[PDB]
């Protein structure tokens, strides 16, 4: 996160840390959608051009974290993945089209004041809040600078959804209906963005109708971090909802 702020305690209880067993390292963000399911960007697991292809094995999930680095002695819960499921038509070859994946925890995790699942939007919910101008919230432990550190604590930023045309005109990469971009316009003089190391984290919105937090997007890709005339791109969760319903109903909690 660039131009963000430290998260408050218990501000984003569904935030999950994708952690590398060895070398022990922070891979990506993720999110808790129930006591046995985690949502992340498919590219955090599999990305052939960079020779990345992680297994259930190579991984650990840290839930209830605040501090990026310290082992949060009686607050965080670490888990093991029983299974990994990637979107069959995830396009790593060209544009990260359908940058989504589900992780099913070996064993169910218990809710506490620091660990709580985020809701998935319904058609109605998606419709009314996914509008250019409406502000969403992004969290991560990613780059603070495009290039310049790494935060001590979970960072947060509120960013407005941007109309598709502007999205499209900001890059040479091909956008699809499963993506949405967000950030401020250079004129709007207000800044901020997600950045490398922020992927798989959640883009969330609080419904004004029932005042529940919903996950609308997944941090996916960008060009640089916080540059004028550029936007962050997010996986369109509502759009991949059927796929999600499907794996959960097929082999899960």
């Amino acid at each position: 996160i660039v131009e963000g702020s430290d998260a408050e305690i218990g501000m984003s209880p569904w935030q999950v840390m994708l952690f590398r067993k060895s070398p022990q390292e922070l891979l990506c963000g993720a999110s808790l959608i129930s006591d046995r399911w985690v949502l992340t960007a498919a590219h955090c697991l599999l990305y052939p051009p960079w020779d990345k292809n992680f297994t259930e094995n190579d991984l650990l999930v840290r839930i209830g974290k605040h501090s990026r680095t310290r082992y949060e002695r009686n607050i965080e819960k670490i888990s093991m993945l029983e299974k990994i499921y990637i979107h069959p038509r995830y396009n790593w070859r060209e544009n990260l089209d359908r940058d989504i994946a589900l992780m099913k925890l070996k064993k169910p995790v218990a809710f506490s004041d620091y660990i709580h699942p985020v809701c998935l939007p319904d058609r109605e919910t998606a419709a009314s809040l996914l509008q250019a101008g409406y502000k969403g919230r992004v969290t991560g432990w990613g780059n603070l600078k495009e290039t310049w550190g790494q935060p001590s604590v979970l960072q947060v930023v509120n960013l407005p959804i941007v109309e598709r045309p502007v999205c499209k005109d900001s890059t040479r990469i091909r956008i699809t209906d499963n993506m949405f971009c967000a950030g401020y316009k250079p004129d709007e003089g207000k800044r901020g963005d997600a950045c490398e190391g922020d992927s798989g984290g959640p883009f969330v919105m609080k419904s004004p109708f029932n005042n529940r937090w919903y996950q609308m997007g997944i941090v996916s890709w960008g060009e640089g971090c916080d540059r004028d005339g550029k936007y962050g791109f997010y996986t369109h969760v509502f759009r991949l909802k059927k796929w999600i319903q499907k794996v959960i109903d097929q082999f899960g909690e």
Binding site: Q24, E25, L26, T69, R70, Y71, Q150
Partner: peptide, 5 residues
């Protein structure tokens, strides 16, 4: 960087 887990 990381602390012992």
């Amino acid at each position: 960087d990381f602390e012992e887990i």
